[PDB]
Design a protein around this nucleic acid. Structure first.
Ligand SMILES: [Ca+2]
Ligand SMILES: [Ca+2]
Ligand SMILES: [Ca+2]
Ligand SMILES: [Ca+2]
Ligand SMILES: [Ca+2]
Lengths: 93, 93
DNA sequence: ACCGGAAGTG
DNA sequence: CACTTCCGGT
DNA sequence: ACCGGAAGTG
DNA sequence: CACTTCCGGT
């Protein structure tokens, strides 16, 4: 199906075998990408789009700021925080 | 039908019209039930289980503590906090 | 009010 | 399993 | 590395 | 419609 980036990141985060590239860290919702290039590769793989990289992936995350789906952890790089306010709304059709 | 309780609460919390009975409040994840009995009634209405009350509903939420799907905001009553660790795993098939 | 054990449901 | 039902704890 | 405007895609 | 692509800012 037509999977979302916020759904894809939760998929990777749920399994601890992906700890090399992405992992939960800090308060509730906060996670960091320990290998942003690896995460961006797998997102391009799922979408059938091998031109994907972290610079293009991060602008995809940026649109979630206005949607209230997630936000940046200011200071700790490659680290973002999911926000239930928008996730809950995005979960419904 | 075929729905989880954690999914049902996020469904209600997405629509702000439901602020009479339940609403987001506090840090990321934290919500409270301003009319706990009204929430329990709609859960019984959804599940087709007419004897549902808060006492029965609260024990369903206590099973989520060991699952890491949510936790209790200690002190503030009728107030619980979703936890992304369990919500991530629970969303997958 | 909130907690978790115990037994039961399809 | 994911609750529902019930109850003796704090 | 992170920010958001802009134009384009399936 | 949710990104994808590109880029001139900080
Ligand atoms: Ca049992
Ligand atoms: Ca009692
Ligand atoms: Ca006891
Ligand atoms: Ca600009
Ligand atoms: Ca540049």
């Amino acid at each position: 199906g037509q999977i979302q980036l916020w759904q894809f990141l939760l998929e990777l985060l749920s399994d601890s075998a992906n700890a090399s590239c992405i992992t939960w860290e800090g308060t509730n919702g906060e996670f960091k990408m320990t290998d942003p290039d690896e995460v961006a590769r797998r997102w391009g793989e799922r979408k059938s789009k091998p031109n994907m990289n972290y610079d293009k992936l991060s602008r995809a995350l940026r649109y979630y700021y206005d949607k209230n789906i997630m936000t940046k952890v200011h200071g700790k790089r490659y680290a973002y925080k999911f926000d239930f306010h928008g996730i809950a709304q995005a979960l419904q059709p």
